[PDB]
């Protein structure tokens, strides 16, 4: 059974005093819903299942998965979490803008043939940018197998400008990757003493109909720590807090405060909370305030999280040419990125706060893009920008916030 | 259970009435000296409606005046109408997202326009809706109305034409595409091999834009953020089929009447239509909106005669003519298929040919007119003759012994009108 | 007389009964006195001579080239066309009461009749009362999407598609279709192009098409499946016969 306490002063990353979810390693690959039987066979079949509702965004969403590494009657000597969700793009304009997104990279390619998508993984590995590939063509001709481990080494000699050094080739295989991954993952440094910081990528309500009269608890929001630990009963404060734009005017953002009840993992989690994992943090909020995936898109803090709430931002356009790795035989103008059109809606994807806007103007060097939402991320962080090419958004640019409007109730 | 909801938009947010919307919102229009959004209100009176919340962004102050002092706003009226506005409005994926942020519907809630000319009973239609959605789990998603036409009638116009492809036997959409400068249509073949029962393509449906939705459509609308129009909403939802299926079904009607007024042709068909008496029980001389104004007597050949009308001898009013209280006729007159505002006034030997004029327009004796519009307070002087689809707009006086070409649109503000004058036609 | 029965034959006198000799007895259960049937020289230009061991009413056979397709069988056979032509096939099971197929020939006077059964990849597309079918194509000539012309909506605004339909290869034709088969050699098989050539070219004294659709039985497809199928349905279709 777990052995968590509630006294603790620095702990480390591979601490046995957690021992539940230390680094998110990141899995991103061709696998085309394939990974999933990876995942499943490196952690198991249904050991992270808490909280179910009907899905919001099921193609924008990032899926946790966390696993627990033993050797030896086995002592266990890490358990990093697999985070993968489909589509490439999204996870790739996440990660590029800020950090703490999928420490560890992990490839799991095919070893039957080197299509685009291929091609396209190593570029979005490139572009996040430790990796990892692993051959996925199980059941295969040994000749067969010599001559796809060939052609594999010629795609990581290509690939080596940016990362060629990765090493693996039906349980055995997820043993010997799951050692090499233990010997080779490296330990990340991460700051525990910086004040609270939560993204909130899920709401719940676990008020199940016709509850007792005082037996309802309600507000056990789901999301990810971004910096730093935080205890149970502390006084959390939601970023984005309740907007209401019936003022006639600029919407009114009220905060709302809570204590937090409780931190739980996939298992029974402790008072402090472990970076890098989908911590679910149970508090005393309104049901009602947080339905069903309602109140996603927020940030949490303990002390006031220093990013304020803002209306409009501008953003130094920086795009890129074509499509990053995603160019087919024919290319009839499909990786061809438009220039900044005036009145485009497209996302802005600030670490795991992904808010949408429409460029109101821009002269070759600012876009002020007002957010579709009021936000608060930071003042200065790096903003991707995103748009859809059909029915799928994707990395079309980068940028830094310069200025804006923001607005502070109470 | 709960009682019926509907939003309703009352901002056309595409730029069709220009310059006339410069001036009056659209929704605002007379259409039969009756507002168009006292129509919308009255087919959702009458279809059952109970709670109705109106979106208003584009001078809202004139709408809210107009609105509070109608009847649907009295303590005695069924419908609790509720004035929301917010410039920050620019399209109806904006109200969408607004609707479920605010969080008003609680299931099963109406969607139209501010401008919908209808009698529609949707009873049956919400029937069909809320037990699929009972029998599937809440599968489907949104429901359409739809009219069977023919593809020759004026108001099927070229703009608006759209074709379908749907499942006969579930009256499920499948696809669905505007038809607007194309001489072929193409039809996805996917959605053959999925149902191999038989499929059915249909061109004769006429787009009411009545939607019965579930606030699954504020979640899909507040998710999917590029959405900004229905038809983006429904071609998205038909393009990302295997994810998030939420299948989409359709309700055609074949015995009443429902239209949406968009530009001046769909409003000249629906203004023949409804003084014509297509969209029974709605009708001029019936008085809907109980106002004292539009009292009316019915006589032959569709002639609405209000009170004080003062007929003068010799004049004629050959069939489908409505004439507003207070408005004064010449002599030798030739009324047809035309509609006279309230105090009026008209010259001797005057023709008047499928015009419209609203309230406080003045024509002097001798001019022809034909097919025109002539907004409030305009005025015409002698010896002047009016081209088909010629527009007169807010006291744009025309000059005496002028003939305006075919395509005129006038109004006293300079660049979006192709002329600007107030005392003649040449400069 | 106006019609002649014209039997295709490019087959094998399989099952318990010779195969040919289940359409051909359809021809005298209505009339059809005379009736021609064309063989295949690919193999033998000689079944003629097997198949004159049968006892039908009355035969005529007439030999083929090596290679020859149903219209080029036609082309072949035009010079003893007078009237109107009945085109069967030899693999075909069916009890189908033919007088409803030529009353669509027979009450509108349309230049092309035929019979189509539902099935148990081309497309088909009739009008709403399911007689006069005014589209068809098939995937072979389709990329990925279906196009319809507007005219034909204009004209016809609600069109119903069938998918898995199976045809019976039985075509009652007029005597022009023939001789504009005279006019252009670039037409070899009447179901692969001389069908859509016509249902196209309805839309430029016109051309009127009916086909007419069946719940009860298909013919004797090439796969050995179908003649199983075929075997099995036989002695429920001769108990009546």
């Known amino acids: 059974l777990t052995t968590l306490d509630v006294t603790k002063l620095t702990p480390l990353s591979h601490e046995v005093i ?59 000597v890490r358990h990093v979490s697999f985070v993968d969700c489909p589509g490439h793009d999204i996870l790739m304009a996440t990660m590029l803008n800020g950090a703490a997104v999928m420490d560890a990279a992990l490839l799991l390619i095919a070893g039957n043939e080197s299509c685009p998508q291929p091609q396209t993984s190593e570029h979005l590995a490139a572009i996040e940018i430790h990796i990892l590939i692993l051959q996925n063509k199980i059941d295969l001709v040994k000749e067969s197998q010599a001559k796809e481990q060939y052609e594999q080494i010629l795609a990581f000699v290509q690939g080596t400008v940016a990362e060629g050094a990765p090493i693996i080739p039906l349980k055995y295989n997820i043993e010997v990757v799951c050692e090499y991954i233990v010997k080779k993952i490296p330990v990340p440094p991460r700051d525990f003493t910086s004040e609270p910081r939560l993204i909130v990528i899920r709401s719940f309500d676990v008020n199940k109909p016709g509850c007792e009269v005082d037996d309802l608890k309600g507000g056990v929001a789901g999301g990810s720590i971004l910096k730093g630990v935080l205890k149970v009963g502390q006084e959390i404060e939601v970023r984005p807090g309740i907007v209401s734009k019936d003022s006639e005017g600029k919407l009114m953002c009220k905060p709302i405060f809570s204590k937090i009840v409780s931190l739980f993992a996939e298992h029974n989690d402790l008072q402090y909370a472990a970076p890098g994992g989908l911590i679910g943090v149970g508090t005393k909020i309104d049901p009602t305030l947080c339905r069903a995936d309602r109140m996603v898109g927020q940030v949490l803090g303990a002390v006031g999280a220093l990013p304020e709430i803002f209306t409009e931002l501008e953003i130094s356009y920086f795009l890129l040419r074509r499509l990053l790795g995603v160019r087919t035989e024919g290319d009839k103008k499909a990786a061809k990125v438009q220039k900044l059109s005036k009145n485009e809606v497209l996302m802005v994807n600030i670490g795991s706060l992904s808010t949408g806007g429409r460029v109101s103007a821009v002269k070759a060097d600012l876009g002020k893009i007002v957010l579709t939402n009021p936000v608060c991320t930071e003042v200065g962080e790096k903003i991707a920008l995103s748009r859809r090419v059909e029915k799928h958004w994707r990395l079309i640019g980068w940028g830094q916030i310069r200025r804006g409007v923001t607005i502070k109730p109470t | 259970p709960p009682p019926l909801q509907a939003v309703l938009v009352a901002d056309s947010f595409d730029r069709r009435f220009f310059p006339i919307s410069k001036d009056q919102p659209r929704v605002l229009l007379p259409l039969a000296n009756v507002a168009l959004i006292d129509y919308t209100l009255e087919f959702l009176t009458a279809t059952g409606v109970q709670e109705t919340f109106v979106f208003c962004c584009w001078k809202a102050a004139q709408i809210k005046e107009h609105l509070l002092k109608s009847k649907w706003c009295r303590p005695t009226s069924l419908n609790v109408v509720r004035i929301i506005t917010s410039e920050l409005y620019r399209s109806l994926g904006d109200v969408l997202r607004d609707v479920d942020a605010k969080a008003l519907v609680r299931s099963d809630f109406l969607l139209v326009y501010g401008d919908v000319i209808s009698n529609i009973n949707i009873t049956r239609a919400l029937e069909e809706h809320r037990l699929r959605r009972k029998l599937e789990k809440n599968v489907s998603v949104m429901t359409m109305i739809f009219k069977e036409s023919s593809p020759s009638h004026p108001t099927r116009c070229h703009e608006d034409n759209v074709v379908v492809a749907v499942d006969s036997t579930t009256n499920r959409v499948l696809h669905f595409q505007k038809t607007q400068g194309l001489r072929r249509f193409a039809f996805p073949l996917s959605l053959f091999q999925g149902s191999s029962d038989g499929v059915e393509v249909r061109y004769d449906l006429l787009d009411c834009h009545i939607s019965i939705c579930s606030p699954q459509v504020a979640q899909l609308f507040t998710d999917n ?128 040919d499928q015009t419209y004029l609203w309230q406080g327009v003045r024509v002097a004796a001798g001019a022809q007119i034909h097919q025109s519009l002539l907004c409030d307070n305009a005025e015409v002087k002698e010896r002047v003759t009016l081209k088909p689809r010629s527009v007169l707009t807010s006291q744009v006086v025309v000059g005496p012994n002028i003939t305006l070409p075919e395509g005129s649109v006038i109004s006293l503000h300079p660049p979006d009108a192709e002329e600007d004058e107030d005392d003649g036609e040449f400069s | 007389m106006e019609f002649q029965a014209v039997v295709m034959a490019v087959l094998l006198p399989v099952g318990n009964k010779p195969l040919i000799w289940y359409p051909l007895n359809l021809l005298e259960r209505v009339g059809f006195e005379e009736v021609i049937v064309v063989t295949t020289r690919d193999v033998q230009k000689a079944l003629c001579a097997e198949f004159k061991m049968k006892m039908k009413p009355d035969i005529v056979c007439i030999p083929d080239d090596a290679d020859m397709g149903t219209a080029d069988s036609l082309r072949y056979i035009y010079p003893k066309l007078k009237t109107d032509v009945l085109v069967l096939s030899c693999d075909l099971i069916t009890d189908v009461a033919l007088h409803e197929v030529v009353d669509l020939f027979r009450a509108y006077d349309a230049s092309l009749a035929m019979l189509m059964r539902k099935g148990q990849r081309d497309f088909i597309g009739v009008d709403s009362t399911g007689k006069r079918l005014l589209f068809m194509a098939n995937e072979a000539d389709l990329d990925e999407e279906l196009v319809i012309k507007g005219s034909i909506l204009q004209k016809h605004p609600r069109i119903r598609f069938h998918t898995g339909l199976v045809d019976a290869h039985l075509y009652c034709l007029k005597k022009y279709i023939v001789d504009f088969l005279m006019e252009n050699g670039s037409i070899t098989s009447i179901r692969s192009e001389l069908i859509p050539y016509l249902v196209r070219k309805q839309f430029s004294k016109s051309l009127d098409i009916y086909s007419f659709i069946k719940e009860a039985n298909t ?6 499946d179908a003649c199983w199928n075929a075997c099995r349905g036989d002695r429920w279709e001769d108990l009546s016969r």
Request: with cysteine.
């Open chain 1, 18 to 76: 957690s021992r539940q979810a230390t680094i998110n390693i990141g899995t991103i690959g061709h696998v085309a819903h394939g990974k999933s039987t990876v995942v499943k066979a490196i952690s198991g079949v249904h050991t992270v299942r808490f909280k179910n509702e009907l899905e919001r965004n099921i193609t924008i969403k990032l899926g946790y998965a966390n696993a627990k590494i033993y050797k030896l009657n086995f002592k266990l």
């Open chain 2, 225 to 352: 953020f590029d959405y900004q129009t229905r038809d983006d909403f429904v071609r998205g939802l038909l393009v990302n089929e295997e994810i998030l299926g939420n299948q989409i079904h359709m309700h055609v009607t074949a015995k009443e009447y429902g239209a949406r007024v968009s530009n001046l042709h769909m409003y000249s068909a629906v203004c023949a239509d409804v003084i014509r008496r297509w969209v029974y029980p709605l009708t001029p001389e019936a008085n809907f909106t109980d106002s004292t104004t539009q009292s009316c007597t019915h006589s032959r050949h569709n002639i609405y005669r209000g009170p004080e009308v003062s007929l003068g001898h010799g004049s004629i009013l050959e069939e489908n003519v409505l004439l507003g209280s207070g408005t004064v006729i010449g002599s030798n007159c030739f009324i047809t298929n035309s509609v006279i505002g309230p105090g009026c006034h008209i010259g001797d030997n005057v023709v008047l």
């Open chain 3, 219 to 224: 013919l004797n497809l090439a796969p050995y």
